Design a protein around this ligand. Structure first.
Ligand SMILES: Nc1ncnc2c([C@@H]3O[C@H](CO)[C@@H](O)[C@H]3O)n[nH]c12
Ligand SMILES: Nc1ncnc2[nH]cnc12
Lengths: 245, 248
């Protein structure tokens, strides 16, 4: 009955956030509400029955690059939920895709469920824990109306892929590969907040181009594709309750 | 405007509750009940006082789905972050059992004072992201503690897998680590962000490059090495009491 009134986006790279920030005329938060001295970046605004916040892990103090990976994504997810109390979290970002699973460069995917491929604990019941299978929040009307591809996401802290990473990714029949998604899901689960994922394919994992080269090659164009979908997602959510999608 | 004075509190971050209990029992710490780190969470906080020092012990506690300790970097980073913001420690101590390399001088039962920490499972083959993924961070300098306790020293390497792949081993060898665990580097990352001094006590329960233990060996090492960790942690607590950060 209660319509959604607050959405938080978790975005690992500032360059990925800006197109969205601009589209909705969000402004950069200036008062460090999640903690003094942190590198994190927050953008806030209202549109129109929705509060919108976009949080980023920010840059490494020493090295200057975006603080990608599961640990920072978990912290900002935790901190933003506790400060802002959103109705729903959306982790938006780029990812690798498998052509064999129907993924094409530029595709923006909704996520059915998520796993980790780099948390291997070979004791029964710890094994399941490491893999961390979690379902994204059910959004069938959004899926239908926006006509998005959907598949399983597999997460780990490496941009390349080890043999053992591949083994787990395949065993879990993942379509998509990223560096934050399963950890955002773990935190959303822990704090009982619906989570949805938008994952935009920059590189083909089963393809013939090197991962880092292809990722970097397509980042800009694919991020604009990600913006277009995230914009339609916000517009759809507005005025709806969680049951509506 | 700021005059420096003795440390007033410490928080221990301990991944597995069984590792924490002997320290809790030794100092008669009480398990808190007023949700100090947030309502509706499985995290456990123990609180007490030893002489002039306030002692907080934080554990990620049991996983809702499966009921096991919530091991690994993500939960460790969360409880570290939340306990710093709520509890305002002067210093954080990541204490726990870990794997070791006999080729690097480690033995079963040794409790190491970690010099510095890295990740072995954050591989990002792009300039400046590569270094970021490795995440090299120095532990807080504690020379007088080391003169007193004479713990072995070594680099710690962290990742979310309990086993070791060849890819894992390659980074661990490249980074010249003596110790292998599942939380330390992530604890250091959070400690760094919030500018809190961090120390690590890492007790070798298994030799990553040594012969497989027997059953009676496995269990014995688990009792005796956890007891060794408690004995060392107790000595650190008695040592830190009444000291400024600069005296250690
Ligand atoms: N093939 C791939 N593997 C893992 N992550 C990514 C990404 C995403 O882009 C960032 C790369 O550090 C990170 O946020 C990750 O989630 N794009 N392509 C990927
Ligand atoms: N061998 C090992 N590797 C990683 N984490 C551990 N924790 C305890 N023993 C370990």
């Amino acid at each position: 009955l209660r319509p959604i009134s607050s959405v938080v986006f978790v975005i690992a790279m500032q360059a990925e956030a800006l197109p969205l920030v601009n589209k909705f005329g969000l402004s950069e938060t200036t008062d460090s509400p999640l903690g003094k001295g942190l590198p994190w970046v927050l953008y806030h605004g209202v549109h129109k029955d929705l509060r919108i916040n976009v949080v980023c892990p920010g840059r490494d103090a020493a090295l200057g690059i975006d603080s990608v990976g599961t640990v920072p994504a978990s912290l900002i997810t935790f901190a933003s939920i506790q400060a802002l109390k959103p109705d729903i979290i959306i982790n938006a970002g780029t990812c690798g895709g498998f052509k064999v699973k129907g993924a094409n460069i530029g595709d923006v995917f909704l996520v059915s469920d998520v796993v980790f491929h780099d948390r291997r604990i070979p004791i029964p019941m710890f094994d399941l824990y490491g893999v961390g299978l979690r379902q994204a929040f059910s959004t069938p009307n959004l899926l239908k109306e926006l006509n998005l591809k959907i598949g399983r996401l597999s997460t780990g802290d490496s941009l390349d892929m080890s043999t053992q990473d591949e083994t787990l990714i395949i065993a879990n029949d993942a379509t998509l590969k990223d560096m934050e998604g399963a950890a955002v899901a773990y935190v959303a689960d822990l704090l009982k907040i619906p989570v949805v994922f938008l994952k935009a394919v920059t590189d083909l994992v089963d393809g013939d181009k090197p991962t880092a080269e292809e990722f970097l090659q397509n980042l800009t164009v694919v991020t604009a594709a990600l913006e277009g979908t995230a914009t339609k997602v916000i517009n759809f959510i507005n005025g709806r309750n969680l049951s509506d999608l």
